[PDB]
């Protein structure tokens, strides 16, 4: 329901601050180890239900909402395993999810010029604007967690943190939810490259600021795995600075 720029500001700006707040509360105010249980089941439920619900949606904004819920579950995996690596994986996941959400909402705002509503309106978009189609496909794959992109690194290190604490069920549920999650992402892909509808919707060209932000984020997503050291070092310093 909310306007597109509002939803763009939401799910990035609020979630980062609230997650930092939860980190501060969890690390200090929680010593009974009772928040492991509440984060465990809720993150598992978020993973499962986001993966199983985003596949049944036909609009775009609902799909982004359920993808956000799924990524919230993926990030919350880090709370259950309370270690330096767990918080590191959590923060890295937040960073990557924020970049991918900015890119995806830039895509959505780009097609908002002609009032895109459903997922079928972006049919045969590889013909009218091939390069925007490539950018959207890359961002969708980054959401999926395909290796040669950012977003795979975040899920990777979240799984590493989950396995470090011995929460073997968290790793398995993460894997299966990722498997289903990639399916409807590729389903989004098919309607946007392969099958061509009879009626084509024409989108007017974009402006420079959105295009520049989109290009920067797209080059960050693809080439992240080449040089990921600065993010990892920032995150390791941040995780340790909670105490010293």
């Amino acid at each position: 329901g909310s306007p597109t720029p509002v939803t763009a500001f939401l799910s990035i700006a609020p979630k980062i601050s609230i997650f930092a707040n939860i980190l501060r509360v969890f690390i200090y105010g929680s010593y009974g180890a009772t928040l492991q249980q509440i984060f465990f089941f809720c993150s598992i439920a978020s993973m499962i239900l986001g993966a199983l619900a985003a596949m049944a949606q036909t609009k775009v904004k609902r799909l982004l909402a359920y993808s956000s819920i799924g990524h919230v579950g993926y990030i919350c995996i880090g709370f259950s395993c309370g270690t330096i690596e767990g918080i590191q994986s959590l923060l890295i996941g937040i960073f990557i999810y924020a970049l991918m959400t900015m890119d995806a909402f830039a895509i959505v705002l780009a097609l908002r010029q002609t009032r895109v509503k459903y997922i079928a309106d972006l049919g045969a978009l590889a013909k009218t604007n091939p390069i925007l189609a490539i950018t959207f496909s890359i961002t969708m794959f980054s959401y999926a967690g395909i290796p040669p992109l950012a977003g795979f690194c975040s899920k990777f290190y979240l799984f590493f943190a989950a396995l470090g604490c011995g929460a073997y069920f968290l790793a398995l549920v993460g894997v299966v939810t990722s498997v289903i999650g990639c399916f409807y992402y590729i389903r989004l892909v098919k309607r946007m490259f392969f099958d061509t509808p009879r009626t084509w919707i024409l989108y007017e060209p974009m402006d420079r600021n959105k295009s520049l932000l989109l290009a920067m984020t797209s080059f960050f997503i693809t080439l992240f795995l080449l040089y990921p050291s600065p993010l990892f070092s920032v995150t390791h310093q941040m995780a340790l600075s909670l105490y010293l």
Partner: protein
């Protein structure tokens, strides 16, 4: 001084340059793509000459730090095993560009971009020594081949082939990834040399080996999951059908020869009979299934499955004969299957049938193609003097050093392989012509008669003098078979 990094960078430069130029000047795009592929091929051949076959340690290593702690990093490097795969994957790509040379105006610049990205990525897979990042590049080929199959594929079932191909490489791939993470957390690094010299728990190697095999039993067409190759291979373009059966089927076997045989030696011994039974039943079942096929593509796709399954019999029989014959038959198949699928592609691009019964008695009309097809299906027979025989007989010899039952079934595989290969040859090139639906049709032009010449010369060079290939690998194979075998 030509290093390993320049070979990796050449396709990257060719792709980046190709994006700069527009699509109107189509001749420039095809010319630059072919030139980049050919210079990469020449660079790969140059790397062959300066390869020390005496030492057991790895050749040129380029280390680029990945994690801030240098815990894991890009550790490139070739050995006796990885060198020939690099040469083959550099050799196949220019052929891929050349087959669809006429239709380049219909495909566009995305086609060559995708193929050069595939060349880069496939080179990066074979010549690297980091177990985790090798996994990253190992299924990184999902995106480019998904694009290649889907965008230019079948009529309307192209969507289903892409989904089956993409689905079979998810559950097993991530179940392997779990083992990757357990290995990383247990030891501490994913460097191959470090991981080789580690004491793994006796009960632990079983789980890790099973996880590795689960993601390699899908790339190698094992008994449970091998139905993707026929359907997703018929519903594929001809240049996408010549690397799918030329390189991708090598990832599972190469992964077995790199991160499965050394790291888990006694687990390999304990799981040896099970692999033998799977490979034997795969050979027999595929041989019996392929002799009642009418699809022009699956008829040799099943031959590819049979050859790949026969590879594992001697690949898992720890022996210098077995492993050497394994890689020799692997290269031989990478050539012969590629040649067969190019023949099927040229047959299909004229008539557009994708059947077997339509063609018949065309020897009087296309004699050159008849001779070339005869030579290729003759190599598929595994004649001595051809590529397949030396490797395949070496596999039989090596397995019969270990066991006497299963590889006799492997040899029984060829009692029907040759039979249905010549029978398939005689469906098409023999008999009287049927000019009821074969009104007009031509023979190979200058392009596709020259494209087979490298295949012919490589095939005969394999057949008559394979000593040069065995020369560079006997150190690496012997080091592989003796690892963790102190006595």
């Amino acid at each position: 001084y030509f290093n390993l990094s320049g070979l990796i960078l050449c396709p990257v430069l060719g792709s980046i340059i190709l994006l700069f130029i527009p699509n109107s000047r189509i001749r420039l795009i095809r010319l630059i793509g072919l030139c980049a592929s050919l210079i990469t091929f020449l660079y790969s051949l140059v790397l062959w000459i300066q390869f020390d076959s005496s030492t057991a340690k790895f050749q040129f290593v380029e280390s680029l730090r990945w994690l801030p702690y240098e815990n894991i990093n890009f550790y490139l490097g070739i050995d006796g095993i990885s060198l020939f795969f690099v040469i083959l994957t550099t050799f196949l790509i220019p052929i891929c560009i050349l087959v669809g040379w006429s239709g380049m105006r219909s495909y566009g610049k995305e086609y060559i971009i995708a193929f050069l990205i595939c060349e880069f990525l496939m080179i990066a897979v074979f010549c690297m020594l980091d177990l985790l990042l090798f996994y990253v590049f190992f299924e990184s080929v999902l995106i480019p081949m998904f694009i290649i199959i889907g965008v230019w594929g079948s009529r309307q079932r192209k969507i289903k082939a892409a989904y089956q191909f993409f689905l079979y490489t998810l559950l097993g791939s991530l179940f392997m990834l779990l083992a990757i993470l357990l290995i990383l957390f247990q030891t501490g690094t994913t460097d191959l040399q470090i991981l080789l010299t580690t004491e793994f728990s006796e009960r632990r190697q079983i789980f890790l080996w099973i996880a590795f095999f689960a993601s390699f039993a899908v790339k190698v067409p094992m008994v449970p999951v091998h139905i993707w190759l026929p359907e997703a291979h018929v519903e594929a373009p001809t240049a996408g059908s010549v690397i799918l059966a030329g390189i991708l089927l090598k990832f599972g076997t190469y992964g077995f020869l790199r991160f499965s045989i050394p790291m888990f030696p006694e687990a390999t011994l304990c799981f040896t009979p099970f692999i033998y039974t799977l490979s034997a039943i795969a050979i027999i079942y595929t041989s019996l299934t392929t002799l009642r096929q009418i699809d022009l593509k699956k008829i040799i796709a099943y031959s590819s499955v049979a050859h790949m399954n026969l590879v594992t019999i001697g690949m898992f029989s720890l022996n210098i004969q077995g492993i050497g014959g394994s890689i020799l038959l692997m290269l031989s198949h990478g050539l012969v299957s590629s040649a067969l699928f190019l023949c099927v592609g040229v047959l299909y691009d004229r008539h557009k049938t994708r059947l077997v019964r339509y063609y018949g008695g065309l020897v009087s009309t296309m004699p050159n193609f008849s001779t070339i097809f005869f030579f290729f299906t003759l190599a598929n027979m595994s004649l001595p003097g051809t590529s397949s025989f030396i490797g395949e007989f070496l596999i039989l010899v090596g397995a019969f050093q270990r066991n006497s039952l299963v590889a006799t079934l492997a040899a029984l595989g060829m009692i029907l392989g040759a039979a249905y290969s010549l029978w398939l040859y005689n469906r098409v090139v023999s008999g009287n012509l049927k000019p009821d639906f074969l009104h007009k049709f031509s023979d190979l032009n200058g392009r596709e008669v020259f494209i087979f010449i490298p295949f012919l010369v490589g095939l005969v060079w394999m057949g008559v003098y394979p000593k040069v290939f065995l020369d560079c690998m006997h150190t690496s194979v012997s080091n592989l078979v003796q690892h963790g075998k102190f006595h």
